[model samples]
Target: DLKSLAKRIYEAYLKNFNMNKVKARVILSGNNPPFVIHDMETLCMAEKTLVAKLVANGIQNKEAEVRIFHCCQCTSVETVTELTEFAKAIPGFANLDLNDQVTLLKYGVYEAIFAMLSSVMNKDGMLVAYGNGFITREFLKSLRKPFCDIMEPKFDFAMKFNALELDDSDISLFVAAIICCGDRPGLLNVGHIEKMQEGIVHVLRLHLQSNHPDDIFLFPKLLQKMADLRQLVTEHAQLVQIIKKTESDAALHPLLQEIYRDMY
Candidate 1:
């Protein structure tokens, strides 16, 4: 809906503006374009048009910024990376990154899917079986591993069961954890993937640290699962953590801070 709405608004704005007369420099300056929709009636028309375009394309509301950048630019290649950085600067997009931004462009789904996953995983809650299966398959496919032995375990643990013999509820929780952890397929770098694995290990460790045997029993298969995906996940998880720590230590600029805050 937002994608469509954005498109309509963009089109209406372009219709009114003399594109030929407008300076290209101004359009690229990161400021909102100057286009008059004058009244509520005109604005509504523009909004409806944009919303329709967005929905038609499966774009999410948060991801509309990428669309805005793509449409506004005269260049052919999608300027997702630039737009993602800009969006990250905004408070509303603090948690989103270039990887997520790119995925949004490709998927055009609602942001809630990502948000929900993040929440469940963060709290060590349940995950979705089907959704995680899709995610794991995609992730492994992206890696293009030559050996089945190398790939299968990572795929299974990340998508299905770790060392524990997962029931439906366990599978669901792992799925949610992956989502909450923002472990989308093809988005993370090898190093980023390692960082994610590290995070998973930390969470698992926390669970293991629990006094209750039932809680420990809950992840009976975790060791084997970790053994399988450890290399990839650890590398990814470490990279992310390092990057995060570096950013925090560097005392990022105010604009950057604003963007990161928004994403969270």
Candidate 2:
């Protein structure tokens, strides 16, 4: 049914599949191995193809719905600004350039992905995209030949925060506030938050293991600062949660299972 629906949607709008129009490659790179996908059209079509194959193999519509829901939740543009701001607050990242800011955002996105992976039960169903030049389509062509020399850490400082246990509702509220607040004077820019997060992650990874006396002295303070930042995310968005939760439940659609299915 999902395959049928996808075909219907695709035919209705995306009829012209000029491969040149889609010019981004999905690359995966890590300590494990490296791989590159040259064509975006092929990659997108492959997803539909897999769905069609699964439906042919008797995958239920409900199963497909659940899978789609899980994917959407992970990729949702929630709390991005708040998280970005949090990143910007990290030491040593206050003066990063625009390109580096974009890099930090990409890193935070992966950090969120890692968090989702660690929290969710369906890790087998998730796809983690790792590789050089995968984050920005605009900057891909500027890379040098082979691109191996440009390979840095797969993610940023915030990646460590991905594993921290926090309330889901709080996270949602934080994201909502960031969306509503926009970029105003005296308020932190979303890009800055992202950079701060990258800095924090970097500091944790590199300095935590240093044997230097000064580094040892600063470790506890740095950790405390991280915890404080986590608290700020929750504190800043508490009202947002209260307002959202108070809204009528009747307006909310059933997320996963039918009401009748429980009795059956």
Candidate 3:
């Protein structure tokens, strides 16, 4: 029953989700080459000089900081668009009240993006520019005050999430669970949405059970990551509020700005 639903979502993920493409495409001649995941050795040995130079120069230029933030916001805005499309593929999402659908997306989009970000992230940094560049955690931390504050928590969360090693199929269900959440405020059809969420979660749990038979704690750990994600989004909204006030010259994506304004 729900297995078919999961299959549909997984197919949607393959079609709609953006994977690392730019540099990765050149690195391997395959259809969708994997992004290079850097550890300490690769980060230091291969990229240390380039990263050090970029960080030193970037940290010194206020405009460079703004540019980095702008690029990141652009990436997120793109993900939000993609996430919305992916949400529609989920069973019963479009049938919800129009306003309820909007509410669910407004609240859940960032959480979904952050969760899937684990795919591009390593313990040290995340791939940016569609995998054309890798920005180290330290470089992000080196940016000035409020901006510097924003990324560390995300990096920390991403690192822990990467440890789970979920595949796109797992992420599809996890993201669906994030979007159909019953707990979002101002929902008119909470019960209906909760039922949707529970169905997805049950399928997700069963999927994980079959996929990783030896790891009983995997399901609970993923649920806990969901809990951690809420806190991350809250703190992110708070910091973005600060950025909104302080970085007047910094441009935000129109969709992202709206989401932040509404969430704020």
Candidate 4:
């Protein structure tokens, strides 16, 4: 039973997760294109047929702000969709009650994205959306309020969290746990989801302790980071009225539009 369940979920995750592509998106910086994500012209500019080598070697850009601003358009429900796809691969997650699924996805996506954020982060800042897009603290704070203020804390968290040197699987599993959470206020099958999350926690605990014995404090540190994400995203949620009324044309994706209406 253990081996079969393990193999079933593992192979399913193997096929569904696309760890290589995920790693390429996050782990490999400036060598690929996951952004401009809005359109192909920008994508080509980031990694055009002739420009691959130059961009790969970190020499070119579509625009300075493309890298500097690293659009928030890249996240929200779009990132939620990615995390939801990962959750869909697991049998327990797939079997989850539908209401529970939406509730968890709605509440948990920001935390998972922030969890993944640590992957691309350095003390300097983070790489976002596309290859050339590296965001720095100075650049983020320069933006308008609520939006700008929301970032510094996240950057602070990322700088400290990435210092742990966690690898790919570490983040993948950590994010998985965040998505499997059952206590999000509206889960119809909270026990089931909590138990499922328990399974993920068991693996995460053993994995972190076994793999990073020298970093005994890391497991709890990740827990603290999740707690931090919850607060940060809540603060962000407060500004929905301000953003939608003013910056609606600024690039709020349709999917986030649907979610924002549902959430607010």
Candidate 5:
């Protein structure tokens, strides 16, 4: 029955995460030569061609800084929306106390998003704009101090997490596990949430066995990723505080503001 339940969660993951819309790949500067996409090329090609417009133009002034951060905000909105839907689709998730749902989603969203990011990320950059654009790691580091460091941990996490070669089904359970975690500060029903998480973890391990039988270390490595995500989220929250203090004009998605509001 848990297996069937896991199957349903995987289906929800595919439906809500919606990676089918992403048609482009992560393009590094050296490996991926800059190209021109004329009218003959597809819309995806055009998007890719312009992805580096701002980055290549450089982040020398406040105008460019705000523009790049706005792009980051837009992507976060899309991510948070998908994560909210994915949480709702879990079988017993809606049955949880309303406040608990809010708390879980708030605390769990970044971790889930970071994990999903591994699918479209590499050491060089991550696929953005529905996977039509690549935001290079070097370009991210070139931004202002606090803002630049925020995304670096994600790339670091993604580099190792991607090596696990987990498929969508595995990621589905992994995401579900992250959301159902029992350790979140304000969770009202700790025991119930822990039981739910245990079930997901069990299924995740079993699925990994069937899917990556040759990789004996996958399950343990995934657990370590869970630990790694904690540091990533903490560092991210800390950086957001600095940005809010120093770069007050930079826009942040209201939803993200809500999630990060009480994080400290």
Candidate 6:
């Protein structure tokens, strides 16, 4: 049963990757490039396309001061929605009590986000969002306060984590573990969740052993990153709350608005 669940998770992740065009081989083939491009093109293109209409009310300024916020919200909204559906479709998650479902989603979404963020983040100081919006470290620093703090550390961690050379299956198992965490604040079925989590960990560990046998420490390092991811998401939740309160221009999508309100 656990194997089937793990296999389903893996396939679901691959399906999502296929739909979103994440590192399969080539992504976003454009006119300028005959062959194909990667996630970077997708991010820049999506950022540009989203902001093309935002020269005024839609956008705050030429500098795109508030434009980043909109992009952030748009990216977060889409990511959370997709993650929610995936989690729900899992028989394990779907069978949870509604309250437990809500709690896991709220607490786990950020971890999942940062985990996926690693796939697109590199040492280049460019963080790709939704594989659509690209945020540069300098621009984030220009944000000048908590906003910069929110993303930069996650990006830094991503850079280092990417060095492990993880593929899609690694991320899938990692994120599945994150979502099935039994330690959420108020979970009714913590026992079952923990059991599921343990199984997921076992699967992931077997994968690491087989896939990364020569690299002995990668498995433990990944486990350590899960803890890091929890902290990262807490910081993200706080920054999003500040954004919600201070900058009111770009209305966050209802889903994100709800998540931020509840989680923050």
Residue 176: error of model 1 in Å? Answer: 4.6
lDDT of 4 by residue, 1-264 (tens): 433443444444445433323554455444444333223344445444423543454444434333222346455445665667778755488898787888888778777666666666555555654334455556556655545665677777777777787766577667777787777866798899989988877777777887689988888988887788887777666665566566533445566655555553
Write the residue-wise lDDT of candidate 5 on 1-264 in tens digits: 867877888889888875521322423322343342222233234443565454344444245456667677777778888888888867568888999889888888888888887776667666666644566677677766766787788888887787777778888888988888889988899988887778778888888888889999888988888888977898888877777888866767788889898775
Q: Rank the candidates by lDDT, best first.
A: 3, 5, 6, 4, 1, 2
TM-score of each: 0.22, 0.25, 0.83, 0.72, 0.83, 0.80
- After the best TM-score superposition of candidate 2, give how far the Cα of residue 56 lies from its true spot, in angstroms: 27
lDDT by residue (73-132, candidate 3, tens digit) is 878988988888888888789889999998899999889888877776665677765555
Per-candidate local distance difference test: 0.32, 0.31, 0.75, 0.62, 0.74, 0.68
**Which regions of candidate 3 fall more than 4 Å away from where they truly are?**
20-62
lDDT of 6 by residue, 20-96 (tens): 22552232221222221124454345545555565543433433445556666666667777787777545577777
lDDT of 4 at 30: 48
**Native-referenced Cα lDDT, model 3:** 0.75
What does the lDDT read for residue 134 in candidate 2? 22
- Model 2 global lDDT (CA atoms, 0 to 1): 0.31
Which candidate model has the greater TM-score, 2 or 5? 5
Q: Regarding TM-score, does 3 or 4 come out ahead?
A: 3
Tens digits of lDDT, candidate 2, 1-264: 323322332232222211111111221212332222234443333335443443344433333323332333323333233345544433434365554544444323323323332222111111323111122222222233222111111122223433332223222222212222212223345566544444333433343343234445344544453344334433323422342355322121232112112211
Backbone clash pairs in model 3 (N, Cα, C under 3 Å; residues 3+ apart or in different chains), count: 0
Which pairs clash (backbone N, Cα, C closer than 3 Å) in model 3? none
lDDT of residue 254 for candidate 3: 78
What local lDDT score does residue 173 receive in model 5, on the 0 to 100 scale?
88
Q: List the residue pairs that clash in candidate 5.
A: none
Off by over 4 Å in 4: 1-70, 245-248, 261-264
**Off by more than 4 A, model 5:** 20-62
Best to worst by TM-score, what's the order?
Answer: 3, 5, 6, 4, 2, 1
Residue 196 alpha-carbon offset, candidate 2, angstroms: 9.3
